[PDB]
Design a protein around this ligand. Structure first.
Ligand SMILES: CC(C)[C@H](CO)Nc1ncnc2[nH]c(-c3cc[nH]n3)cc12
Ligand SMILES: [Cl-]
Length: 167
């Protein structure tokens, strides 16, 4: 039993809750929170901007040093950094940005990063301001992630649509 409370079970390993991932992270302090990152780790808006704001910009400072040392991530790739005050670790995962014409097939590669962690709190990758269909993102998640994933979706109307259309 974990500290994740109030989730709906979708499959053997995938769970979902109508909540701000930031607030869920502050409450649970999970081992891993996933950030919906871009290749430059510029956490300007969406989930990333919200997570970074909750760290008082410490996530951005750490990220800028990471990029200065290592260069940009790949679309579909990830890196593990500190979770600051939100979690032990933050897994920064880059889903394809559909508004920029990036290959949506890279969404599966992005979700594969989750399999390196036994339990994660996560948003829907490539959805939101990244422009992809959230119903599709949830499907790729369920069909790719084999570890235990707790999905937080802040938008109530979207959450309702995600649940209603699942089985
Ligand atoms: C990725 C989308 C499908 C999904 C739709 O809700 N976005 C989120 N999911 C989970 N937690 C979230 N927190 C915020 C937030 C909080 C303060 N500013 N922005 C957005 C957001
Ligand atoms: Cl978003």
């Amino acid at each position: 039993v974990n500290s994740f409370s109030g989730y709906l079970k979708l499959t053997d390993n995938v769970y979902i809750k109508n909540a701000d991932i930031v607030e869920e992270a502050k409450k649970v302090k999970p081992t891993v929170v996933v950030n919906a990152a871009n290749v430059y780790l510029k956490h300007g808006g969406g989930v990333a901007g919200a997570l970074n704001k909750a760290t008082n910009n410490a996530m951005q400072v750490e990220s800028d040093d990471y990029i200065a040392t290592n260069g940009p991530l790949k679309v579909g790739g990830s890196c593990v950094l500190s979770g600051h005050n939100l979690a032990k670790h933050c897994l920064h995962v880059v889903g394809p940005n559909v508004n920029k014409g990036e290959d949506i097939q890279l969404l599966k590669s992005a979700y594969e990063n989750f399999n390196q962690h036994e339990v994660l709190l996560a948003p829907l990758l490539s959805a939101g301001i990244f422009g992809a269909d959230p119903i599709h993102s949830l499907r790729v998640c369920v069909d790719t992630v084999r570890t235990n994933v707790y999905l937080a979706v802040f938008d109530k109307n979207l959450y309702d649509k995600l649940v209603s259309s699942f089985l």
